[PDB]
């Protein structure tokens, strides 16, 4: 029951790929250890293929079926609607990969006759045929990391026409069903601050809290045909139009369960029998399957008063401690059960008795103080990957601006405020591009955002306290400082000096620019200004933000 079979044809690129960090006049102001930063390319795709190709065995017991029955009971309450062709078209990113059949994303977005006629033909084919495997493209992702090299991850996706049809059939389902089935355990319904609140309140709900993260090794490749059919059975519990039931069956049989892999040159590379990383249901499917396996494993291990938090393949569990020795024993049983369910561990899970020591969604809770001196919890992460990616983006325009996503999601953090805000506002100022909209990605969806709207966006997501936090923990400060030394980034004292300059330059611009100076860089002046609620912030349409995850799902706004 192999995750993949291969022909020996290579996974090929679409254009020249760079692995070495490009350097321009701005690079050394941010990062001097250029050799630490690299991008993955198709040259490492063979190594990735070896890692993700293996046999999956699955033994399913009564705990698994009991949890599944409960999930299906909750799913039965969901009513989901078909999207119109127009609605689905307007969800397509402007720079989404063009179709092989003679039209592109902008043709889709404009509702061109050619595009709309083809989408109708694809839809009719889904209704009429529930058996023929749907072709997919396989490509090596180009992502940036700091050394200590990862092989490229693989992306697998069907044609643009099919992607639009997935939205028509499943957008409402994948946006609504997860929170109904999993309630407060569904992670993608939370902003960063909401996630912190849930984690803190859950920790406090236990007499003697214990928590752990669980890392499944190569999750997508552990997902079996069984798993994908079980997912479909959950979708079909919803109140759906008959037409939608048929399209969902067809997509499951023809696309989600598996299909042929074609490289960028049109050659057959092999066949997939595990999760595709580039379909609409990747996020919802991984979340449901992870929750199902983990909930059943909790029961196997007799964990007391378990509360889970699930975002795709990323899992956190907080429960009542039965003692340190008993806790470690329970985790072994948990892992054994997950392994039987085809979710074997990467790193073995570790019990933690301090909430700040748990990492999940690459992040941890930490504590700072607000302007009144109150202790406030907030979400942070190790800044190594953010800074490596920011270095790349200093010298190259990319389709997704990680620095922008990171400023939005980690606005309250020491590193996002002192380094990312300072560095990028200085660059944009110099080019007068503050008002130019940029694409970023949050929970898998693409947003087009004007940097000048950051103050209002931050206030809405994090509150005004994001502009006032200070007295960060020694642990957090020490981690940031050591990261800077590692990458050869100037120390925080240099960044404070630069932020005073950037703040003054923004204030001299007037308007929204001055608001950025005032709010984003109040921390850099000795005599702070008041900072009152921004009237524009109460006006922003942040509907669609933090409802669901759509990683690989080709979703825009
Ligand atoms: O977890 C993320 C995700 C995210 N997490 C995921 C976790 C598991 C599966 C799929 C995703 S995903 O591809 O949908 N995206 C982001 O897209 C993200 C983007 C930012 F710009 C900054 C931080 C981000 N974080 C950490 C923030 C923490 C509240 C959860």
Describe the overall structure:
It is classed as transferase. The entry lists the keywords HCV, hepatitis, NS5B, transferase, RNA-dependent RNA polymerase. The assembly is monomeric. The chain has 557 residues and is of the alpha+beta class. The chain has four domains: 1-55 and 133-158 and 258-273, no CATH class; 56-132 and 159-182 and 224-257 and 274-280, no CATH class; 183-223 and 281-361, Alpha-Beta Plaits, CATH 3.30.70.270; 362-557, no CATH class. The chain has 20 helices and 14 strands. It has helices at 27-30, 45-52, 62-75, 85-90, 105-109, 113-128, 160-182, 192-205, 219-222, 225-235, 242-256, 282-300, 324-340, 384-395, 402-409, 414-431, 454-462, 474-487, 492-509, 511-520, and strands spanning 4-6, 37-39, 136-140, 144-146, 154-157, 209-214, 259-262, 268-272, 304-311, 314-320, 364-369, 375-380, 438-442, 445-449. It is globular, with a radius of gyration of 24 Å. The structure holds the ligand O=c1c(C2=Nc3ccccc3S(=O)(=O)N2)c(O)c2cc(F)ccc2n1CCC1CC1. Ligand NN2 binds at residues 192, 195, 283, 311-314, 361-363, 379, 405-406, 409, 441-444, 549, 551. The ligand O=c1c(C2=Nc3ccccc3S(=O)(=O)N2)c(O)c2cc(F)ccc2n1CCC1CC1 binds next to helix 8, helix 15 and strand 13.
């Amino acid at each position: 029951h192999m995750s993949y079979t291969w022909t020996g044809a290579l996974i090929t690129p679409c254009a020249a790929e760079e692995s070495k960090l490009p350097i321009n006049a701005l690079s050394n102001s941010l990062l001097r250890h250029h050799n630490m930063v690299y991008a993955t390319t198709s040259r490492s795709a063979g190594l990735r293929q070896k890692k993700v190709t293996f046999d999956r065995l699955q033994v399913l017991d009564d705990h698994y079926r009991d949890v599944l029955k409960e999930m299906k009971a909750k799913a039965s309450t969901v009513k989901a609607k078909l999207l119109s062709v127009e609605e689905a078209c307007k969800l397509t990113p402007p720079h989404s990969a063009k179709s092989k059949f003679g039209y592109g994303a902008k043709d889709v977005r404009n509702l061109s006759s050619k595009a709309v006629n083809h989408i109708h033909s694809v839809w009719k084919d889904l209704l009429e045929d529930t058996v023929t495997p749907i072709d997919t493209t396989i490509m090596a992702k180009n992502e940036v990391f700091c050394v200590q090299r990862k092989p490229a991850r693989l992306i697998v996706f069907p044609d643009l026409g099919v992607r639009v049809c997935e939205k028509m059939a499943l957008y409402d389902v994948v946006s609504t069903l997860p929170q109904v089935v999993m309630g407060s355990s569904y992670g993608f319904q939370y902003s960063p601050g909401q996630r912190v609140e849930f984690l803190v309140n859950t920790w406090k709900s236990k007499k003697n809290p214990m928590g752990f993260s669980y890392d499944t090794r190569c999750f997508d490749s552990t997902v079996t045909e069984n798993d994908i059919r079980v997912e479909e059975s959950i979708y079909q519990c919803c109140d759906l139009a008959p037409e939608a039931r048929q399209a969902i069956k067809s997509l499951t049989e023809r696309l989600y369960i598996g299909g042929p892999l074609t490289n960028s040159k049109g050659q057959n590379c092999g066949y997939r029998r595990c999760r595709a990383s580039g379909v609409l249901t990747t996020s919802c499917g991984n979340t449901l399957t992870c929750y199902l396996k983990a909930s059943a494993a909790c029961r196997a291990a007799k964990l007391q008063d378990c509360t889970m938090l699930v975002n795709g393949d990323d899992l956190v569990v907080i429960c009542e401690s039965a003692g340190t020795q008993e806790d470690a024993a329970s985790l072994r049983v948990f892992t054994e059960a997950m392994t039987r369910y085809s979710a074997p561990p990467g790193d073995p899970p570790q019990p933690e008795y301090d909430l700040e020591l748990i990492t999940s969604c690459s992040s941890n809770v930490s504590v700072a103080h607000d302007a009144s001196g109150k202790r406030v919890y907030y979400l942070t992460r190790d800044p190594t990957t953010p800074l490596a990616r920011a270095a790349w983006e200093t010298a190259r325009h990319t389709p997704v601006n990680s620095w922008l996503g990171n400023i939005i999601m980690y606005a309250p953090t020491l590193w996002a405020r002192m380094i990312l805000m300072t560095h990028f506002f200085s660059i944009l100022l110099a080019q007068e591009q503050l008002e130019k909209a940029l694409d970023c990605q949050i929970y898998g969806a693409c947003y087009s955002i004007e940097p000048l709207d950051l103050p209002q966006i931050i206030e809405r997501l994090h509150g005004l306290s994001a502009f006032s936090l200070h007295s960060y923990s020694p642990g957090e400060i020490n981690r940031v400082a050591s990261c800077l030394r590692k990458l050869g980034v100037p120390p925080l004292r240099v960044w404070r000096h630069r932020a005073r300059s950037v703040r003054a330059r923004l204030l001299s611009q007037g308007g929204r620019a001055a608001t950025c100076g005032k709010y984003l860089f109040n921390w850099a002046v000795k005599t702070k200004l008041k900072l009152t609620p921004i009237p524009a912030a109460s006006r922003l349409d942040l509907s669609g933000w933090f409802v669901a995850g759509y990683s690989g799902g080709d979703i825009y706004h």
